[PDB]
Swiss-Prot record:
UniProt key word ATP-binding: no
InterPro entries: Pept_C11_CLOspp, Peptidase_C11
Residues annotated as the enzyme's active site: 171
Name this protein carries in UniProt: Clostripain
GO biological-process terms attached to the record: proteolysis
Coiled coil: none
Entry EC number(s): 3.4.22.8
Amino acid sequence: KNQKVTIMYYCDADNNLEGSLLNDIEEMKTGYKDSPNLNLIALVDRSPRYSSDEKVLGEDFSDTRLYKIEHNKANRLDGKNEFPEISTTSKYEANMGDPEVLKKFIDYCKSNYEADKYVLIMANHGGGARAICWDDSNLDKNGEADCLYMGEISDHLTEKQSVDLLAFDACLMGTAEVAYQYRPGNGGFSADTLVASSPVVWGPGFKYDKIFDRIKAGGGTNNEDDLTLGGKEQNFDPATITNEQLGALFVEEQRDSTHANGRYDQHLSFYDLKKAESVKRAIDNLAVNLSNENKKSEIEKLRGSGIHTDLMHYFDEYSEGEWVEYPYFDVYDLCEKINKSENFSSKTKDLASNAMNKLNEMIVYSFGDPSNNFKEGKNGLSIFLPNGDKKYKIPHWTMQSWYNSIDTVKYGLNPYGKLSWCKDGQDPEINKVGNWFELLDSWFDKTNDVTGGVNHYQW
Ligand code: NA
Ligand code: NA
Ligand code: NA
């Protein structure tokens, strides 16, 4: 009733999105309403090549800094003990792709700005369940920009850094694997609720000024209609705001901002992550059935290929590169087409209906393309469904060994796997499918000896 809310903005502007993220910070300063129940602490890492702005944060710089944002104001902070490399006069360059930096940021905010509710907004690029936050200041073992892999974040972060809400201001983050990775009760770092978009997010990103202009005490409303909650858009007191109200804020303001500019391809969803497991298990059941009834042909006919797909998806199907990297399809649409197709038995239909029920329970709010018959609260979550047999000649599935449960670098594959979505629910028996990962591996890996085929996993 008199809670305090700390919002931690992990701003990785060390890339081409620097100007957009500086505009986002300006929007935060504009919309932020000063209150003793609210804190906005931002770890901003800028770039030395793109934007040369000096009006948002007071000067032009290229290092990593800690700021506290208030109305029309951003005061630079000291790193103190949790981040001793950062001071009010330091010139420290951080690697935002290093999960230890994110860990130090979360610990700093929890130590110096204690609160009853924690929100974590991670802002950068995004690439599904593989990664997030690419940093141009540090190069990996391939000469590319270092990034945060989901399994890497789980490996380095513990339960001490768990948050109440996790917002991904990045592309292609609303996947079932991502939501399951950070579910509460996984033993380590987790988020009670997740805000994410299944497809790419447009340039402007989130309309933070409107969001923070609605995080205000005193009650009241504006004249704008609320299409997620019904009625008029309400103001939510920081002393009493809940996870659901903040998520509805994100979803509704993104809907209004995107549709105002005629961008009906944009999406955003709010998930209760304590339902994530309930969805995963559900899909897993379906997966087992899909293995036992030899339905690879029918699922491939539902998914499609090339530019001819009828499943609701969140990538540019005209780009084979996106087919290889982000073949993410809507889970609810897949289960609905299974349940309504005449190429599936009654058992498969019932398992798909159970998956739909769990999905409806998980996805609290969502908005999408109305021309695609988007079902709010049902559509809005994606799942990895590759064209594993299509050759590029190299098959797609061999280029997707990152979608794995193992330590891929330890087995010579491309950086990082360790996705709990792929690990949990595996059937230890050989030639036996236990979960979605093993189903895909059984469908697309042509050899299954002890060496584990192309992804070094024996299903
Ligand atoms: Na950096
Ligand atoms: Na509205
Ligand atoms: Na394999």
